[PDB]
Scaffold this active site. Structure first.
Site, PDB file in Angstrom:
ATOM      1  N   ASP A  98       0.783  -1.221   0.000  1.00 51.21           N
ATOM      2  CA  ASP A  98       0.000   0.000   0.000  1.00 51.21           C
ATOM      3  C   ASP A  98       0.827   1.290   0.000  1.00 51.21           C
ATOM      4  O   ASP A  98       1.291   1.744   1.055  1.00 51.21           O
ATOM      5  CB  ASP A  98      -0.894  -0.040   1.248  1.00 51.21           C
ATOM      6  CG  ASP A  98      -1.882   1.076   1.368  1.00 51.21           C
ATOM      7  OD1 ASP A  98      -1.939   1.931   0.451  1.00 51.21           O
ATOM      8  OD2 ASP A  98      -2.614   1.088   2.352  1.00 51.21           O
ATOM      9  N   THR A  99       0.959   1.903  -1.176  1.00 51.58           N
ATOM     10  CA  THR A  99       1.709   3.156  -1.268  1.00 51.58           C
ATOM     11  C   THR A  99       1.037   4.306  -0.557  1.00 51.58           C
ATOM     12  O   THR A  99       1.703   5.315  -0.298  1.00 51.58           O
ATOM     13  CB  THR A  99       1.963   3.509  -2.713  1.00 51.58           C
ATOM     14  OG1 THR A  99       0.714   3.618  -3.416  1.00 51.58           O
ATOM     15  CG2 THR A  99       2.823   2.439  -3.392  1.00 51.58           C
ATOM     16  N   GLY A 100      -0.254   4.167  -0.260  1.00 54.45           N
ATOM     17  CA  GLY A 100      -1.000   5.203   0.448  1.00 54.45           C
ATOM     18  C   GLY A 100      -0.889   5.103   1.957  1.00 54.45           C
ATOM     19  O   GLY A 100      -1.478   5.932   2.676  1.00 54.45           O
TER      20      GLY A 100
END
Ligand SMILES: C[C@H]1CNC[C@H](CCc2c(F)cccc2NC(=O)CC(c2ccc(F)cc2)c2ccc(F)cc2)N1S(=O)(=O)c1ccccc1
Ligand SMILES: [Cl-]
Ligand SMILES: [Cl-]
Ligand SMILES: [Cl-]
Lengths: 99, 99
Positions: A25-27
């Site tokens: 998850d880059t967020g």
């Protein structure tokens, strides 16, 4: 590897000698995993999501293998809907976004 | 481009004639933007995760421009703490995770 996003980017991780599924998850600023036993002392932490903030347990210098790549760093434990590998460990494994 | 994950992957987007900053989030299935007007029909939806769920308005066939790349898809509008570009639009710009 190169992972496309037509499906959730779920990979196998290994933590505490156990295999689990986790979402890249880059967020997420940090890595958060569902309830499990981790060694050492923990510190308090609050993380904010789409629906508000939750309290988690912060464990430092935890050994975790992500899709076969070794990482050692902070792992949060709490009531997350899925195990999430956040930027703190994605940077350790050399993950980038490309388009 | 190649975006590293040392900091949040924030980009400028153009939606509904407005310039906005949004997070490229591989952990989000859907794209969710803070309150704004969009044209066309909409239907209610609940989305959730860390902290629980929020109610949003679902607009379909919305055009977005992300780093000069045009993409069309469903956009959810609601009380999100940050504008999020989810997988439904990251795929359209050919975004992949690489390590
Ligand atoms: C800001 C971002 C950053 N991480 C992703 C998440 C996406 C939320 C989201 C959107 F934004 C827009 C549209 C849909 C959704 N939700 C999903 O896609 C569901 C999904 C999910 C992923 C992470 C969750 F924590 C909760 C739920 C899910 C995967 C597998 C499964 F079996 C069940 C559910 N949010 S967050 O909760 O706030 C958050 C913030 C800081 C750290 C961790 C998370
Ligand atoms: Cl770390
Ligand atoms: Cl879509
Ligand atoms: Cl593709």
């Amino acid at each position: 590897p190169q992972i496309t996003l037509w499906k959730r980017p779920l990979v196998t991780i290994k933590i505490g000698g156990q295999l689990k599924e986790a979402l890249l998850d880059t967020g997420a600023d940090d890595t958060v995993i569902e309830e499990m036993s981790l060694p050492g002392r923990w510190k308090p932490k609050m993380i904010g999501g789409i629906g508000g903030f939750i309290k988690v347990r912060q464990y430092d210098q935890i050994i975790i293998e992500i899709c076969g790549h070794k990482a050692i760093g902070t792992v949060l434990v709490g009531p997350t809907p899925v195990n999430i590998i956040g930027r703190n460990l994605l940077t350790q494994i050399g993950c980038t976004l490309n388009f």
